[PDB]
Amino acid sequence: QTLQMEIPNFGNSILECLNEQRLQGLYCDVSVVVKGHAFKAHRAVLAASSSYFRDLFNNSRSAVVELPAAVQPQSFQQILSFCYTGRLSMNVGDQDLLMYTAGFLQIQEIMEK
Amino acid sequence: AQTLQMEIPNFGNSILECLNEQRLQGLYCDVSVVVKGHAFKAHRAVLAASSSYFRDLFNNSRSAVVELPAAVQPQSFQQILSFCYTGRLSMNVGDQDLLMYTAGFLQIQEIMEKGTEFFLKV
């Protein structure tokens, strides 16, 4: 006799809270610095969507990581937001940079087919 | 915050599932919660999203290891931890009282409120 409970779309709700947390700088365990702009985040969430961060966080315990000159802050901001929401916004004029950065950071689900 | 170029449905559902797998392998975890000498790796963020007790505990401390009081049992805790990462709670008839007590202690408010509830599994 098993008793069972199941909350529908639980992950959807939890990731929203994690995004709120990040937006308010709560329970973050890494700071990612891009051209002198610091973004707080959770390693776990970055790792879930990026094989680049997966490999980096597998191999380094530093509290801050700085990305190379490739990555620009606006682009990174969009990618970060994607990792917490599954939404990627449109970028008029810098779609090439955004795509380059997504590829660089090996964001696996951002491109299709 | 205008035009999206992509939107993955049910993204959070899949990501939390990834987070659960990471925990089960000890990856990218930032806290170790110890219960009657049994240590559990976790992510503070995932605990805090579901547990008012943990939110509090993490703000009144600066420590990678947390020890829960002796009133909290390991098997029950494991069930609560899994729930925080899945939204599913499972257990045997005969263990519901202990699980409910543990959920109360850790102030998992999704567990004891209106909405979905426990059932007998098929």
Q: Does A61 touch chain B (CB under 8 A)?
A: no
| CA B70 to centroid of chain Cα atoms | 19
Tell me how close the Cα of A91 comes to any Cα of chain B, in angstroms.
Answer: 9
CA distance readout (Å), B122 to A3, A4, A8, B71: 9, 9, 18, 32
Helix (H/G/I), strand (E/B), else coil: B12:
helix
The experimental technique behind this entry is X-ray
Sheet-wide strand order for B88-92 = B88-92, A2-6, B119-120
Give the residues across from B32 on adjacent strands: B41, B65
Candidate from B2, B22, B118 with C-beta closest to A90:
B2
Q: How far is Cα B100 from Cα B106, in angstroms, rounded to an integer? A: 10
Q: Are B77 and A53 in contact (CB under 8 A)?
A: no
Q: Are A28 and A41 in contact (CB under 8 A)?
A: yes
Q: Does B16 touch chain A (CB under 8 A)?
A: yes
Nearest residue to B50 (alpha-carbon basis) of B16, B18, B91: B16
Q: What is the resolution of this structure in A?
A: 2.1
Task: Give the CB-side neighbour count of residue B57, counting CA atoms within 13 A.
Answer: 22
Q: How far is Cα A28 from Cα A61, in angstroms, rounded to an integer? A: 14
Kindly list the residues from chain A whose CB atom is less than 8 angstroms away from the CB atom of residue B111: 5
Go through the domains of chain B in sequence order and give each one's CATH number: 1-122 (3.30.710.10)
Ranges assigned E (strand) in A16-79: 30-34, 37-41, 64-66
Q: Are A76 and A101 in contact (CB under 8 A)?
A: yes
Candidate from B3, B86, B115 with C-beta closest to A90:
B3
Rounded-to-5 percentages of helix, strand, coil across chain B: 45, 20, 35
Q: How far is Cα A16 from Cα B62, in angstroms, rounded to an integer? A: 25
Q: How far is Cα B120 from Cα B122, in angstroms, rounded to an integer? A: 7
Q: How far is Cα B47 from Cα B28, in angstroms, rounded to an integer? A: 14
Tokens standing for residue A102: 């997504």
* Interface list for A 65-84 with B (CB within 8 A): none
Q: Are A98 and A91 in contact (CB under 8 A)?
A: yes
**Helix boundaries (H) for B8-109:** 11-24, 44-50, 52-59, 74-86, 96-105
Q: Does A29 touch chain B (CB under 8 A)?
A: yes
Q: How far is Cα A44 from Cα A47, in angstroms, rounded to an integer? A: 5
Task: Give the CB-side neighbour count of residue B51, counting CA atoms within 13 A.
Answer: 26
Gyration radius of chain A over CA positions: 16
Kindly list the residues from chain A whose CB atom is less than 8 angstroms away from the CB atom of residue B31: none
Q: How far is Cα A40 from Cα A28, in angstroms, rounded to an integer? A: 6
Q: Is A2's CB within 8 Å of B48's CB?
A: no
